[PDB]
Ligand binder design. Sequence first.
Ligand SMILES: [Ca+2]
Ligand SMILES: [Ca+2]
Ligand SMILES: [Ca+2]
Ligand SMILES: [Ca+2]
Lengths: 90, 141, 159
Amino acid sequence: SYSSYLAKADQKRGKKQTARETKKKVLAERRKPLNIDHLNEDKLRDKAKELWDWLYQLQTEKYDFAEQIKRKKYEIVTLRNRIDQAQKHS
Amino acid sequence: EEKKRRAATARRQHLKSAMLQLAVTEIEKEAAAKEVEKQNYLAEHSPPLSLPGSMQELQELSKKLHAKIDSVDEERYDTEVKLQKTNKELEDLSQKLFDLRGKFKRPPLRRVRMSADAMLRALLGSKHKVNMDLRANLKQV
Amino acid sequence: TDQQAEARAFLSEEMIAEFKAAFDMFDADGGGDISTKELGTVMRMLGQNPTKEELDAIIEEVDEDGSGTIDFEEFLVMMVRQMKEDAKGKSEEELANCFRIFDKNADGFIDIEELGEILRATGEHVTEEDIEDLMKDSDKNNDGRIDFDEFLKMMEGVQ
Ligand SMILES: [Ca+2]
Ligand SMILES: [Ca+2]
Ligand SMILES: [Ca+2]
Ligand SMILES: [Ca+2]
């Protein structure tokens, strides 16, 4: 089975490269430059925190997405045991 | 002819309920404690901000944050994707079980609409007094 | 109509009483049945945005007289099915959670050891015999542990 080796390259490289740009497209949208540079002095104040909240915003979400996979990862472990337990090739 | 056997079963029940009852009270403990960890994690990774002087600092800091944003955001993204991957993995497993048993309890994805209790509250607001669950009602004396 | 039977048999006057008040609000004109449009309005009030297809499907789910509308009877049926599903989900969720708490271990099971702990963890008084007894009664596939399926079964009935 070595004629399938060319399938690995094509496939993997393919999907992986597809995923990349998507991530880039996606992430790019959610990005508004720091255009506001030297337009006011107290502006920075009302600005800086807004950035701060956005960060905290994202941060908090990342934490949740995180804890979520963990919980799901456990859903799996169990869902796998139910699969084996429910084998009985009788 | 095992006349007493009846009491044995009742025990298991008494215990089972002693178990669940234990579960529930432990369930909310882990829950809140969990949250605590969440606010501590966030406690250091993004502590109560303190705006600097002004001139260089506010600009600097702003640049600092803004860059971290693209950073955290990317991480947030990768995470979301590993989740997608995961939810995917269990959906397939949530299949390999269906067509091998059929409709089993506790599907991982759970398609749930809003509860009737929700709809009722949502529509009548104040006057919605029925802790509906299953308890039927037959005249009391 | 047979469904509208047990359905109304299931609910209480209290239930009907409120489900009516609720039904009335669904029904604009006050004719006697929710239309494919009258439903749409409420659904949005409830925070949704169904499509013509979606709406009908939701309608003809309890439309036994092929009317294309819903009467306070077909409605009660609907509320019932939901009532049911709701309570089912809440149940399995709780148990699911209980299993994770009792599992403490990760292996997706519940071995006689943990069963003991958790049991002993309750205020109740128990001797090993009780623990191993409950295990033997619960473990149907006689492999020693207690899988989620069995856990659902064993807890079937308790609160
Ligand atoms: Ca009408
Ligand atoms: Ca009708
Ligand atoms: Ca275990
Ligand atoms: Ca077992």
